[PDB]
Write a protein that binds this ligand. Structure first.
Ligand SMILES: Nc1nc2c(ncn2[C@@H]2O[C@H](COP(=O)(O)OP(=O)(O)NP(=O)(O)O)[C@@H](O)[C@H]2O)c(=O)[nH]1
Ligand SMILES: Nc1nc2c(ncn2[C@@H]2O[C@H](COP(=O)(O)OP(=O)(O)NP(=O)(O)O)[C@@H](O)[C@H]2O)c(=O)[nH]1
Ligand SMILES: Nc1nc2c(ncn2[C@@H]2O[C@H](COP(=O)(O)OP(=O)(O)NP(=O)(O)O)[C@@H](O)[C@H]2O)c(=O)[nH]1
Ligand SMILES: [Mg+2]
Ligand SMILES: [Mg+2]
Ligand SMILES: [Mg+2]
Ligand SMILES: [Mg+2]
Ligand code: NA
Ligand code: NA
Ligand code: NA
Lengths: 158, 158, 158
């Protein structure tokens, strides 16, 4: 059975844990819990293939160099977290020693009205990296499966 | 004589104290003074009614649950303070145990040129909460009476 | 030989040192080095005049009141640094006891895709101060000579 090693990175509070727990357990963690298990496993069918997702949920700035693909997460109501993405991408480029790493840019908290990052800004950043941009809500589940499954489809192209 | 219990909330440095002192004393505090009295009282006539404003000027994150109406203040040159509004609104929703609380969204420092929050962004956030948006300058007095008097008119609808 | 006393100011990490080292030594400092010499000297020809640039590279918040002209630097991928410009300008206004100080607003890191400050936002802020806006990249050298030489041309108008 094929295993996909996914690593979730991005600034503190963007919803890395909430996104991963929504995917794995179909539950929204509505609080900020600073003691959540980093390692998640799930058997899923993606495009007719039974596979294992091995997910590492990292802390807002080892884990990195074992990763096959990366979710780079910011929050659409957190301009600083969007600006911080380049530093996370530079870290991934350094550990993978490549500018061709399977990666999805994730704009989380898309359920919230206080948007300070336009879809077009994030599309432009993702384009500059040669990666897809997907908006998600860990709260409503919008885009959550799409973000993780798209990352698997990006790993399959590597 | 009718008393209106107003509470001013929002991020550090957005001008909660400057706004309240401009309303009450017709003076602009041009410095950042970290030891300002939290409690203000003023007898005013609003729509022909002689009334008392009992204003609590809170610190950038009791006071809350006694409040009848809330000014949720950000600065139009402070994107983080605009993003922080949702956390202040969530706090008000928690203490008032209602999503129908008399509230005005205030975009302060509208005299400044370094605008990073568009009027339309703030209008959209206020719309999502079902509340008015008003821009103010504690410096020029623009919108200051309008912000506080509108909050009184919102309390009168509750 | 005419000496131009230039002072580079702005928030931590915007690239004040990278800009000054790119101008003086034609090298991009790709790391964040917290122990860089503050004082730079260079003999240059600007509009046919052989002159000395005496440059003071300040830390993200003496140096100030000796300055004849100021580069006020933010990063186009750092909204907070753009918002912080007004505080640096207010400091310059205080030490020079004038609202007519030779000054250029510099939008640095223009090579980066994660733009959160629009050119038009910065043009509007610069217009409000009566100063030019120039975009730079300490990395590619885009606009670097233009920023410093424009500041010299602003000092010559004082
Ligand atoms: N409204 C909304 N809130 C969200 C969403 N995702 C996360 N949150 C909220 O944002 C806060 C932080 O979420 P969390 O998953 O702990 O963030 P994190 O990126 O893992 N933080 P850290 O890096 O410190 O571990 C929580 O209160 C959570 O409920 C979302 O999509 N919508
Ligand atoms: N230009 C301008 N400056 C303002 C305006 N309102 C406040 N300020 C300035 O912003 C700074 C902070 O104001 P202040 O009222 O102390 O903010 P606060 O929200 O009460 N801060 P805290 O939460 O720490 O008590 C002061 O230097 C003040 O002069 C405004 O409308 N325009
Ligand atoms: N991509 C890019 N990076 C830049 C640019 N200018 C600076 N940097 C990077 O940004 C970081 C900070 O640069 P630095 O010059 O040290 O900033 P500073 O304004 O002097 N910081 P401080 O106020 O603490 O002294 C460095 O890693 C540097 O390589 C630029 O134009 N483009
Ligand atoms: Mg977490
Ligand atoms: Mg914007
Ligand atoms: Mg105060
Ligand atoms: Mg420096
Ligand atoms: Na890439
Ligand atoms: Na409401
Ligand atoms: Na000026």
């Amino acid at each position: 059975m094929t295993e996909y090693k996914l690593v979730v990175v991005g600034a503190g509070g963007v919803g890395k844990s909430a996104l991963t727990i929504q995917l794995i357990q179909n539950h929204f963690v509505d609080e900020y819990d600073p003691t959540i298990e980093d390692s998640y496993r799930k058997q899923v069918v993606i495009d007719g293939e039974t596979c294992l997702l091995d997910i590492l949920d990292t802390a807002g700035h080892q884990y990195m160099r074992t990763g096959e693909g990366f979710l780079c997460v910011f929050a659409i109501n957190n301009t600083k977290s969007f600006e911080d993405i380049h530093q996370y991408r530079e870290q991934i480029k350094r550990v993978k020693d490549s500018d061709d790493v399977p990666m999805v840019l994730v704009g989380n908290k898309c359920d919230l009205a206080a948007r300070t990052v336009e879809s077009r800004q994030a599309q432009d950043l993702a384009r500059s990296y040669g990666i897809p941009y997907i908006e998600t809500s860990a709260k409503t589940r919008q885009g959550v499966e799409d973000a993780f499954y798209t990352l698997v489809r990006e790993i399959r192209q590597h």
